[PDB]
Amino acid sequence: MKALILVGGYGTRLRPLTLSTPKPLVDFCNKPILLHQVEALAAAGVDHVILAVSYMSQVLEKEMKAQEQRLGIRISMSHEEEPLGTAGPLALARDLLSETADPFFVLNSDVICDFPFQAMVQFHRHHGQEGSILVTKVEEPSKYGVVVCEADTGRIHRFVEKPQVFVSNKINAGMYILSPAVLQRIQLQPTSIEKEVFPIMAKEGQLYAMELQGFWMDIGQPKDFLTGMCLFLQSLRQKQPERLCSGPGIVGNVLVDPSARIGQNCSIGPNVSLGPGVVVEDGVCIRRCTVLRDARIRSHSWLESCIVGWRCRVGQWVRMENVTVLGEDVIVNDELYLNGASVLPHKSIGESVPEPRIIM
Amino acid sequence: MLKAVILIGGPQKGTRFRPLSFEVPKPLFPVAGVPMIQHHIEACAQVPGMQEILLIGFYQPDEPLTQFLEAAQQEFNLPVRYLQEFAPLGTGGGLYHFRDQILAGSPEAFFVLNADVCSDFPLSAMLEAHRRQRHPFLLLGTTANRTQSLNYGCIVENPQTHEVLHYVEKPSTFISDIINCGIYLFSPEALKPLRDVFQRNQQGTIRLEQDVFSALAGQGQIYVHLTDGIWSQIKSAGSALYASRLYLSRYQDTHPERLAKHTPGGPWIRGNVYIHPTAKVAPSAVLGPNVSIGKGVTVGEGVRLRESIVLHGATLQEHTCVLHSIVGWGSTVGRWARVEGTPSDPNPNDPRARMDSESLFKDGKLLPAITILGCRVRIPAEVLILNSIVLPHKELSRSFTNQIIL
Ligand SMILES: Nc1nc2c(ncn2[C@@H]2O[C@H](COP(=O)(O)OP(=O)(O)O[C@H]3O[C@H](CO)[C@@H](O)[C@H](O)[C@@H]3O)[C@@H](O)[C@H]2O)c(=O)[nH]1
Ligand SMILES: Nc1nc2c(ncn2[C@@H]2O[C@H](COP(=O)(O)OP(=O)(O)O[C@H]3O[C@H](CO)[C@@H](O)[C@H](O)[C@@H]3O)[C@@H](O)[C@H]2O)c(=O)[nH]1
Numbered sequence: 001m002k003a004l005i006l007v008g009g010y011g012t013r014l015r016p017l018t019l020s021t022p023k024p025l026v027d028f029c030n031k032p033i034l035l036h037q038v039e040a041l042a043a044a045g046v047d048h049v050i051l052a053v054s055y056m057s058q059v060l061e062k063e064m065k066a067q068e069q070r071l072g073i074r075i076s077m078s079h080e081e082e083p084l085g086t087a088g089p090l091a092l093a094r095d096l097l098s099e100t101a102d103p104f105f106v107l108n109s110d111v112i113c114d115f116p117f118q119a120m121v122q123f124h125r126h127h128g129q130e131g132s133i134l135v136t137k138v139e140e141p142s143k144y145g146v147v148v149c150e151a152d153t154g155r156i157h158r159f160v161e162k163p164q165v166f167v168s169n170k171i172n173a174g175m176y177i178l179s180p181a182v183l184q185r186i187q188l189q190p191t192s193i194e195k196e197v198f199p200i201m202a203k204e205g206q207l208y209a210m211e212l213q214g215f216w217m218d219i220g221q222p223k224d225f226l227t228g229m230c231l232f233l234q235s236l237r238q239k240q241p242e243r244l245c246s247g248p249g250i251v252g253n254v255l256v257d258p259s260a261r262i263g264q265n266c267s268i269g270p271n272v273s274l275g276p277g278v279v280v281e282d283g284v285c286i287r288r289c290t291v292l293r294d295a296r297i298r299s300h301s302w303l304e305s306c307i308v309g310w311r312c313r314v315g316q317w318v319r320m321e322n323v324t325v326l327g328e329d330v331i332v333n334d335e336l337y338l339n340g341a342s343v344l345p346h347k348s349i350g351e352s353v354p355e356p357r358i359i360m
Numbered sequence: 361m362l363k364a365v366i367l368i369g370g371p372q373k374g375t376r377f378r379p380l381s382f383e384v385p386k387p388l389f390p391v392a393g394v395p396m397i398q399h400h401i402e403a404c405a406q407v408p409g410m411q412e413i414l415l416i417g418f419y420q421p422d423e424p425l426t427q428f429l430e431a432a433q434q435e436f437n438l439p440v441r442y443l444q445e446f447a448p449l450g451t452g453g454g455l456y457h458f459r460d461q462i463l464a465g466s467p468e469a470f471f472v473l474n475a476d477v478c479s480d481f482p483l484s485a486m487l488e489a490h491r492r493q494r495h496p497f498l499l500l501g502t503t504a505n506r507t508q509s510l511n512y513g514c515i516v517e518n519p520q521t522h523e524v525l526h527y528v529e530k531p532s533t534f535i536s537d538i539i540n541c542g543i544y545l546f547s548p549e550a551l552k553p554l555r556d557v558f559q560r561n562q563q564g565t566i567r568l569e570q571d572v573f574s575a576l577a578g579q580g581q582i583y584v585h586l587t588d589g590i591w592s593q594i595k596s597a598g599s600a601l602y603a604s605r606l607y608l609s610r611y612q613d614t615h616p617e618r619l620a621k622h623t624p625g626g627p628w629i630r631g632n633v634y635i636h637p638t639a640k641v642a643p644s645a646v647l648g649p650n651v652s653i654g655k656g657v658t659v660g661e662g663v664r665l666r667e668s669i670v671l672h673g674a675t676l677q678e679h680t681c682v683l684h685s686i687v688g689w690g691s692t693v694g695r696w697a698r699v700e701g702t703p704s705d706p707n708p709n710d711p712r713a714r715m716d717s718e719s720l721f722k723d724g725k726l727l728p729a730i731t732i733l734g735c736r737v738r739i740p741a742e743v744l745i746l747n748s749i750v751l752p753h754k755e756l757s758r759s760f761t762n763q764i765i766l
Contacts, residue, residue: 283662283678283679285679285696285742299662300662300664300679300681302679302696302698302742304742316664317664317681319681319698319744335664335666335681335683337698337700337746352700354746354761
């Protein structure tokens with residue numbers, strides 16, 4: 001079988017981070033979020049995954065052809081020249097997967113979760129109908145599309161795309177298996193599958209629901225990115241307690257890349273991911289923060305719950321908080337304070353930003 | 361023979377625009393390391409023939425004030441006395457009520473100094489002009505902005521004879537740019553017109569600027585001596601910090617042993633920094649410009665202090681950043697904690713800008729200014745205090761921003 005990852009056009013979400021690289025290329029726990037999904041797809045045994053991107057990016061082509069060899073499967077990349085929504089990807093991929101009559105995978109790129117793919121294909125085989133949806137129960141159904149859940153059978157009574165009806169607290173999980181028969185139903189003109197195909201497919205009752213076990217989180221948006229990393233480290237501690245770094249001056253669940261160096265007398269707090277090649281000087285306390293690669297954090301500085309961009313230089317005595325995001329090659333002067341400030345790349349910062357605005 | 365009268369205020373009359381200290385008197389507040397009236401006492405003791413120094417004000421004699429008098433008397437080898445008014449008698453009422461204590465000994469002239477001014481104190485230059493002309497009132501005068509002059513007392517003078525022709529006190533409209541600096545020289549005849557004002561009050565309290573200066577102006581009795589040096593008024597917390605900066609820059613000419621040297625083996629010092637001998641600062645700490653440290657302060661490893669004033673006995677732990685803030689005595693700042701304030705300052709484009717002071721609320725909104733920590737305030741670890749006034753004996757547990765913490 002085959003698997004279609006919807007990369008798509010660049011989003012307004014996570015925009016200061018993804019001005020340099022595409023959104024599926026940013027390092028999430030030292031791995032791109034392309035990599036996590038294609039990792040678990042390689043464990044699933046799919047020989048052909050396909051990315052539907054809406055603007056061609058040569059660095060993305062570089063990276064996919066590089067990972068292509070060691071991953072062991074062939075990768076085809078089909079390009080949307082004008083965005084057809086998210087339903088139109090299957091319409092352009094129709095001639096690319098029409099040769100096999102075998103149910104295929106579709107994933108969103110911005111979801112990070114435990115991947116139950118063999119249980120997914122067992123659920124899809126047992127229910128026997130065309131469309132199988134994965135869903136999850138969460139906190140707030142107001143950001144996602146809410147479904148209705150059944151008994152043992154699991155047939156979806158009704159699908160709603162947009163909130164404020166509050167029929168359940170379950171949401172869509174962003175990964176499905178679709179049949180070759182529903183791919184007849186979708187036309188080639190632009191529409192969106194989650195809103196407009198699922199809403200007429202739920203009327204007959206072909207759609208079924210399967211609920212996720214652990215730690216589903218969308219990471220398209222930066223404060224969702226930080227809580228998704230913090231939720232990833234919990235299950236990573238339970239699954240791989242050997243990968244997580246343990247130290248005398250380290251508290252909580254910390255993952256450090258082995259290229260990274262950390263000075264003494266400094267307290268790395270809980271749920272912190274340090275990228276490959278970061279230089280953390282001494283006396284720096286970092287909690288709930290992800291530092292991307294090549295970033296040098298000078299001494300005596302404090303950082304709680306932020307994202308530090310690539311090849312960045314944070315000055316001394318700098319306090320950052322409230323998920324402040326720094327772009328690629330950002331210089332922060334000494335003794336500044338940043339609170340809620342998304343910073344565009346290649347810009348030095350000379351003034352305190354106590355109030356959460358985007359900087360030039 | 362000359363004595364000098366320092367008009368320290370009372371407790372109600374301070375009415376602080378930002379309370380620099382809740383528990384110590386305002387005239388004993390340490391500006392640039394030493395108390396605020398110790399600058400007046402030292403500059404008066406440098407003047408030849410200074411017999412005595414009197415302090416008139418209606419503070420009750422708490423033991424801090426009397427203990428300061430114990431210290432100053434044996435420090436400068438001058439008798440320094442405290443004469444307490446029975447009631448708040450105004451600026452010039454306390455001078456008239458205590459005329460027997462000032463006039464005793466028959467001084468040739470006597471200085472009157474406001475306690476809240478921070479100045480050059482060119483008392484010898486005023487004394488030379490007074491010995492030249494022997495006129496009853498001599499006023500120090502400074503040049504100010506057209507907007508800033510409405511806060512002080514404006515003086516219109518004859519430019520040739522240096523005599524006041526008109527005086528007005530905090531006018532609604534612009535009058536003149538010269539402002540009264542709160543430093544005067546009084547001949548012994550000058551207690552005679554004050555007495556006249558007292559009789560008009562019977563038909564107790566004499567305001568010196570409004571009743572004596574603003575009435576006798578132009579009649580040949582008041583003369584202004586213009587001056588050049590540094591002058592500021594210590595009204596609020598931010599103006600106290602700016603006055604401390606002015607004194608630390610003035611220290612190079614008079615007391616080079618007071619400023620901390622560069623000391624590459626010890627803590628880093630940029631700019632003018634006063635560190636007390638009893639205070640122990642770790643060698644990794646770096647203290648930025650215009651920073652005063654008090655007696656018994658234990659500045660920890662890795663601290664950055666810029667534009668601050670640390671009172672006696674405060675402790676700052678590791679990796680803390682303190683910018684534009686007054687730290688009260690005995691206060692504890694935990695590690696990785698940041699105490700920040702906003703330096704309102706003075707305009708950099710204005711030619712003569714005098715750094716106004718504003719009373720805590722612009723138009724019903726709290727305005728950002730110097731962070732005040734009260735006495736024995738415990739700031740916990742890894743927490744941010746921003747633009748705040750913290751009352752004494754209060755231990756915080758979370759970060760506060762733009763708030764008065766009761
Ligand atoms: N090929 C293609 N893919 C696209 C396009 N636009 C978006 N995608 C991919 O589709 C995914 C969803 O993009 P969003 O626009 O952020 O969707 P959403 O508002 O978050 O809502 C969707 O995802 C939620 C979970 O994250 C779901 O709960 C919800 O039902 C819906 O499907 C993203 O990973 C994006 O890469 C496109 O034009 N073309
Ligand atoms: N003994 C006594 N002293 C007092 C009293 N009230 C004030 N003082 C002291 O007298 C000095 C000035 O008192 P203010 O009445 O508050 O004057 P101001 O508003 O600060 O302005 C005065 O000083 C300016 C410079 O500081 C001058 O420019 C201005 O003309 C005026 O003289 C202060 O040190 C204050 O402590 C009092 O009732 N009794």
